[PDB]
Design a protein around this ligand. Structure first.
Ligand code: A1H4I
Length: 502
């Protein structure tokens, strides 16, 4: 669970909560209400509260005096299982022992707040299915709530909508009897596990929240208009779901693999990692690269980090093994004086050996937003293994935030798409930035969404947060920021508009 994140709390509200309701080792995280990408970890130690800044400019969560993380849940899991690791400026250990839980329901997928009983019945009738539910404000009884649930199997009376009144009495919630809950989430979780049974026997199964994010692609402009009045609230609802994605990353945690990771705690899930075969028998662990397969759930991707000097050979082994023919690089080699990805390709017209692999740079072509490099990759000693690999190097992404206009990214992805589609039996498209989660996740999700619209036209269903959750189950923290989340919507809107004009 992620109850330690409080989306609508001030610094002083956080201090008072930890002092009145917490103990030493108590903690919570919260966003800054005016600087998105800024978060604070507030921690109680020696009867006083310390506030620790976490910044995310788009690549990773950077904890002051700690490490870089793919998600706030991974950050919290790391320190709740590693004492002595989190430290202040003056060096003392700060311990995260006791999450201080938030009662606020506004980031729950099932919470609709102000909503009429007739509006909720229409939404549940049109969009809902057996077990679809929502919680809304009563309107008749102020301060109380209603849980509306659809149960059932043409509109022939085989299904129905039931309303269950939820009383709020002295900051606890109940359905008219039995247990009184600290929050609506606790109530919903209880009646999700232990469903209410009606007198005549109907089980009110809370199977899934009502789906409000699935839109018809033609109506993207109207959804964007609505979110622009929010994008922040829909993004935070998505982020609340990240506690469901704490999958194991054991291989990346092995001593033999530690120096193959750019950031020690940003690791590939075991269940989707790229496994390298045919390694040097002399190298004890030769099967590991910080990379995952992203299979939308025909075109697949590999999301990976920027090469380290000691992983360039493994990068080319992956490319060769997976039969990838297109690489997308979304960083300059150096940004803000820091190395983001080593040069892993030869100079134009040059030939270099990278371990058992040989690469020729045949030709480079510069466009305004990117450079294309036509590379020839083969195994040393085996001439007939040569294949062309087209590297698309996006060069104009800003150092922080996102492009102001998506036209450049969309023209780049169209060209990448056409190259991939032109090559018979090409493997997954490799996409990498620096950590391989923020820009990489953004480019991949845009590509996935646009691909739907390319095959099905302007009239098909898309669901941005559900697509992002699905990509996040295959590599940690894919899509890092609210700014990238907004950019994904803007890119898809711009794509639909250029398709209508044509
Ligand atoms: C409100 S919703 O349930 O319609 N949309 C939605 C929001 C956030 C995360 C996910 C994952 C699947 N759907 C999501």
């Amino acid at each position: 669970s992620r109850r330690w994140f409080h989306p609508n709390i001030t610094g002083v509200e956080a201090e008072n909560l930890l002092l009145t309701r917490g103990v030493d080792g108590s903690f919570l995280a919260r966003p800054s209400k005016s600087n998105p990408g800024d978060f604070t970890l507030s921690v109680r130690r020696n009867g006083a509260v310390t506030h620790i800044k976490i910044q995310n400019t788009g690549d990773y969560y950077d904890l002051y005096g700690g490490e870089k993380f793919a998600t706030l849940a991974e950050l919290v899991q790391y320190y709740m299982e590693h004492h002595g690791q989190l430290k202040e400026k003056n060096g003392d250990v700060i311990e995260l022992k006791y999450p201080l839980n938030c009662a606020d329901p506004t980031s729950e997928r099932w919470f609709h707040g102000h909503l009429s009983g007739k509006e909720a019945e229409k939404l549940l009738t049109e969009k809902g299915k057996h077990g679809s539910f929502l919680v809304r404000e009563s309107q008749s009884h102020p301060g109380d709530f209603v849980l509306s649930v659809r149960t059932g199997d043409s509109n022939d009376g085989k299904s129905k909508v039931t309303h269950v009144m939820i009383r709020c009495q002295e900051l606890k919630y109940d359905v008219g009897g039995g247990e009184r809950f600290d929050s609506l989430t606790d109530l919903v979780e209880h009646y999700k596990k232990n469903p209410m049974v009606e007198t005549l026997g109907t089980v009110l199964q809370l199977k899934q929240p009502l789906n409000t994010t699935r839109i018809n692609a033609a109506e993207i402009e109207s959804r964007v208009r609505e979110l622009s009045k929010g994008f922040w609230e829909e993004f935070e609802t998505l982020q609340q779901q990240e506690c469901k994605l704490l999958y194991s990353r054991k291989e990346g945690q092995r001593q033999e693999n530690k120096n193959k990771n750019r950031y020690k705690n940003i690791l590939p899930f075991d269940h989707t990692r790229v496994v390298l075969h045919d390694g040097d028998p002399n190298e004890p662990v030769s099967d590991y690269i910080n990379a995952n397969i992203i299979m939308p759930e025909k075109k697949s991707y590999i999301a990976t980090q920027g090469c380290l000097q000691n992983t360039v050979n493994d990068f080319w082994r992956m490319v060769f093994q997976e039969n990838s023919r297109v690489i997308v690089m979304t960083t300059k080699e150096v940004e803000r004086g820091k190395s983001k990805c080593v040069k892993y390709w030869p100079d134009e017209y040059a030939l270099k050996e990278y371990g058992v692999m040989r690469v020729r740079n045949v030709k480079e072509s510069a466009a305004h937003d990117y450079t294309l490099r036509e590379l020839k990759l083969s195994k040393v000693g085996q001439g007939n293994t040569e294949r062309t690999v087209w590297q698309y190097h996006f060069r104009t992404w800003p150092d922080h935030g996102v492009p102001s206009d998506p036209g450049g990214v969309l023209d780049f992805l169209e060209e990448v798409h056409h190259k991939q589609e032109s090559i018979m039996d090409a493997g997954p498209v490799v996409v990498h930035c620096s950590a391989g989660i923020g820009r990489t996740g953004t480019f991949i999700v845009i590509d996935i969404l646009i691909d739907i619209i390319r095959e099905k036209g302007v009239d098909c269903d898309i669901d941005v947060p559900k697509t992002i959750q699905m990509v996040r189950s295959q590599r940690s923290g894919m899509v890092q920021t609210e700014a990238q989340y907004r950019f994904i919507y803007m890119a898809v809107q711009h794509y639909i508009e250029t398709l209508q004009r044509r």
